[PDB]
Amino acid sequence: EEKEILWNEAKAFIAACYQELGKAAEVKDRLADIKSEIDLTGSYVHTKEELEHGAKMAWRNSNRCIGRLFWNSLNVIDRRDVRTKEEVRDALFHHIETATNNGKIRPTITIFPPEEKGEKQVEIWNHQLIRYAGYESDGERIGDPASCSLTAACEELGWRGERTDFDLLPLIFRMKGDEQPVWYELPRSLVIEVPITHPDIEAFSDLELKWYGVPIISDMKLEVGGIHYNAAPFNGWYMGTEIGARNLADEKRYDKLKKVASVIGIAADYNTDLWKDQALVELNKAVLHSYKKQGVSIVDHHTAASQFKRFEEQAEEAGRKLTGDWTWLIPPISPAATHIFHRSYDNSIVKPNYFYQDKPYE
Amino acid sequence: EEKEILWNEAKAFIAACYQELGKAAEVKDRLADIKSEIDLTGSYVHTKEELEHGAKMAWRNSNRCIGRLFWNSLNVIDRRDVRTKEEVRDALFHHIETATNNGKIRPTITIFPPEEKGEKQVEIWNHQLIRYAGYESDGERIGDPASCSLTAACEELGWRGERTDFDLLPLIFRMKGDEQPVWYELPRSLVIEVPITHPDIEAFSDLELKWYGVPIISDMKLEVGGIHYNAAPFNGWYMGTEIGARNLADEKRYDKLKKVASVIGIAADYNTDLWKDQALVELNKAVLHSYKKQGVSIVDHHTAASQFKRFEEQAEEAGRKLTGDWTWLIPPISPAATHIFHRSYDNSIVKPNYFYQDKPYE
Ligand code: HEM
Ligand code: HEM
Ligand SMILES: Nc1ccc2ccc(CCNCCc3cccc(F)c3)cc2n1
Ligand SMILES: Nc1ccc2ccc(CCNCCc3cccc(F)c3)cc2n1
């Protein structure tokens, strides 16, 4: 019965994958092999080629992602061989180093052993591999509010943050068999951070803002042909608005707009002055400038949408249906200046894909 | 059968309307009267109270409208008595004058006789009562591109535009029985326009931009209890982004961002400079400033969203379900600075409401 769902998904993925790889003649035999592997074992194991192409398809099918033009150049690291927490740790350290690539960010995914019985082999607690802690007590807010629950769970495990606004959370994950996760402090040498300065407002550095170089999302499940890779961290480079319009701007995040308005020398008193809008534009300019100045990859939302238009065109040329989530594809600043805003998208879910899964804490 | 749809809609509207008006005891008799009016006549006629409250409900149910807090103060003009094109014309002139109110804009709707057999009594061709013409020929673009087809239809009827970028289209409508619409030039004394200047960039006036004071949407059908008022022009005041982020900004409209960038003294060469975003903010500041300076009502998108939050709260307090279209409710600049962006809305259609209908030209 679960053998059935698995087999069905397998037939559909293998057929599609092999067509795309020009290997359509090998399908029958491969499905035969898989069919008996499922009977005898309960599961099946992807070839390296299948796993690589599956991860790329999953990115291509991610409706909410504007960065999909580059789906076929995803760097896929196969870590299905790991068995120990030291190996997991070192694989995560390695992912950080190789994805960072001295600033010339490589889109990368590291794939850990998949769920067996729905039983996880490796369970990653981090939302992203590099992320700042958050604290709230006594009406005192420090750091990133979105990290409050994970921060508190880490401090239950004997970690202690310095309570700066930018404490790096340790890696935290649990191995099958263990009742508790282990945690490891990130080596600072591995983590590139970018101080935020503005191209012509010198006082902007007074805000002492920074952000980390590489977003490495580590809590989503990659699903490929019925196999559930719950631990499969991946990264791209940032689109600047993620940092300047949301992480640093949102009232429930770092909430910096009023401070930005002050350092750029504008009043923050009247809605009709559009001071929040002006502050947003200057903060977003500063973020792009700062990343570029430091030699860390980043994309602005106009260039990103132009790339996404090419992705739409490429999909059409290939005979593939395009799917998308308009509400996530439009950027949070000047959305109507992009073509995305002016068209609609079919939000159907196609697999392989990346999926949310329940947090193991909270 | 059509008598059936009508009766059903009637039962539902009358029940709801009278509950809201504290008149629940009068429903049975009123429905009885309506029931036989439908049998004998094929239709029924709203009382003035029903028509007024119905128009207000229709605004309250308009999913795409951020301005709904003020639904209950809609000024409803009952023009079901009109029979001639001179009366229609004068009613439209009157709507302009009274809605404008010397700049202190009154949200108003003028309701004309409804469809009878699905046969229109009055068919308005204008999209808005005040709107600029558009021309395209020989790769020459003049005025508002969105008005190109209506402009060409008017010029088929013997009207001729001066081919400025801001020619006012004449009122154009057709009476039942007539094969062609008639058109009437707007009296310039009735039409307030606002020149666009910037609060501190003096050269902004070099763009010679302007826009009209009052958006009076004249091509939607108001539906109330099964009765179809295809001709029922209404207006609010503008939210500034409608003008500065869309009408003046869109590449398929006045396409002014590159000219804005030049007059504000910034380069328009690199996406990463976010020059379009900065241009958008300055243009939008200029629009709000200009309207305010001239004493014409307008709302900025932050204040508008704050009002809409109060509308959500009021709906909850009243026990009414809230409906909305997130994709139209978010403003086209700094949307993530509004609460709207951070929640979802049920996009169900509730009646009474306003609906699209097919254009009578093109
Ligand atoms: C190469 C640079 C990349 C850029 C610039 C980019 C850009 C973005 C942006 C802006 C979002 C929306 C985020 C938000 O609003 O919070 C997003 C969502 C997403 N991206 Fe990409 N992305 C890139 C690479 C990748 C890669 C390599 C993958 C996976 C292999 C991926 C998968 C996704 C997924 C799954 C989401 C949706 C996450 C969710 O629903 O919470 N992206 N991307
Ligand atoms: C009082 C000031 C008002 C403001 C500031 C306001 C604001 C807006 C805005 C910004 C939109 C979106 C327009 C677009 O993106 O093109 C909108 C849509 C709409 N508004 Fe309002 N509005 C107001 C009054 C009214 C009134 C009086 C009515 C009717 C009685 C109305 C009915 C609607 C409808 C039906 C739509 C959707 C139109 C469509 O689907 O094309 N609004 N409103
Ligand atoms: N630039 C990129 C590349 C890949 C991405 C993949 C996923 C995401 C979305 C991450 N945010 C999900 C929603 C969320 C979750 C947890 C905390 C938050 F503040 C927000 C952003 C990405 N950005
Ligand atoms: N003229 C306008 C004004 C406001 C607009 C606001 C948004 C849009 C986007 C059109 N894309 C719609 C996405 C969508 C809409 C409705 C249902 C969906 F599932 C998805 C177009 C607009 N055009």
Ligand SMILES: Nc1ccc2ccc(CCNCCc3cccc(F)c3)cc2n1
């Ligand atoms: N401020 C207001 C008040 C009422 C409104 C009622 C309706 C509308 C939407 C009008 N635009 C509809 C889409 C459209 C149609 C025709 C030409 C266009 F450029 C765009 C805007 C409103 N704005």
Ligand SMILES: Nc1ccc2ccc(CCNCCc3cccc(F)c3)cc2n1
């Ligand atoms: N953390 C983030 C990042 C991007 C976002 C982008 C958009 C939103 C809006 C949530 N509202 C969704 C509206 C919607 C979504 C999906 C289907 C619908 F019918 C309507 C929240 C976001 N949160």
Ligand SMILES: [Cl-]
């Ligand atoms: Cl992020």
Ligand SMILES: [Cl-]
């Ligand atoms: Cl308009």
